[PDB]
Amino acid sequence: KLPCRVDGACDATIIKMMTDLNKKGIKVASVGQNYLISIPASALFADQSPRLNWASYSLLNEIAAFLKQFRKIAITVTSYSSKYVSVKRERALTLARSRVVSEYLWSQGVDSRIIFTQGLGSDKPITSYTLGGDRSPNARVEITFRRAV
């Protein structure tokens, strides 16, 4: 007479998709209720351009399913990239990438009231190994959120 779980979400499903994304190379970590999905930009975009490959849409679909598995209020999509031309250049590129990923995730309707978008360019890397372009470890897109209740 009343739902026994949040509609369309299963614990076995969440575990399976976390395992699958980590196997693929997308880092899905969870500290407390806070979840992080770190995506290498080489698996989403072209070389230092805000244009997703058509093949990456399957990955974005899996990430959309993962986000739909939870109930939340605000997601945050942040973009970082290696230094290529100018500070303004990578800032604009990262903001555009965050905008595009956020638009696709929003269209693949997730249970999120707000999806904040930002790109800091090359402000906060996670590795000292800065060699490379989009293959560099700290050229990535972070989808961070907190599970609601």
């Binding site: 209020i73 965050s98 905008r99 638009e103 009231r113 707000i114 999806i115 904040f116 978008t117 930002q118």
Partner: protein, 107 residues
């Protein structure tokens, strides 16, 4: 809308009270149908602006419903201020990085 704009055209833009700045150009796609204060606080937190509230919150809540897609936090705050109207007003001070929501002096 046409007849009222003709009757009295607007004279002041709320961009004076909410001047945009860096990190207020972060973007957000919102779908909100609750009281104004929580949405404003979330916007301010995502803009890394300290949230301040002025005036007594009325017993009847200042409900707002923003359903947008990918516009800057300054634009979202402007939309929230316009929708609040005579009940509440949003101001942004970028020198002190303060987002201030003030409830009008009605009652």
């Amino acid at each position: 809308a046409k007849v009222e704009k003709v009757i009295t055209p607007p004279s002041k833009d709320n961009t004076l009270t909410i001047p945009n700045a860096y990190n207020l150009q972060a973007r957000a796609s919102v779908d909100w149908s609750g009281p104004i204060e929580e949405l404003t606080a979330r916007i301010a937190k995502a803009a890394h602006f300290r949230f301040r509230v002025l005036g007594k919150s009325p017993s009847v809540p200042v409900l707002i419903s923003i359903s947008t897609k990918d516009e800057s936090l300054a634009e979202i705050l402007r939309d929230i201020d316009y929708q609040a109207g005579k009940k509440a007003s949003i101001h942004v001070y970028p020198n002190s990085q303060v987002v201030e929501l003030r409830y009008a002096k009605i009652y």
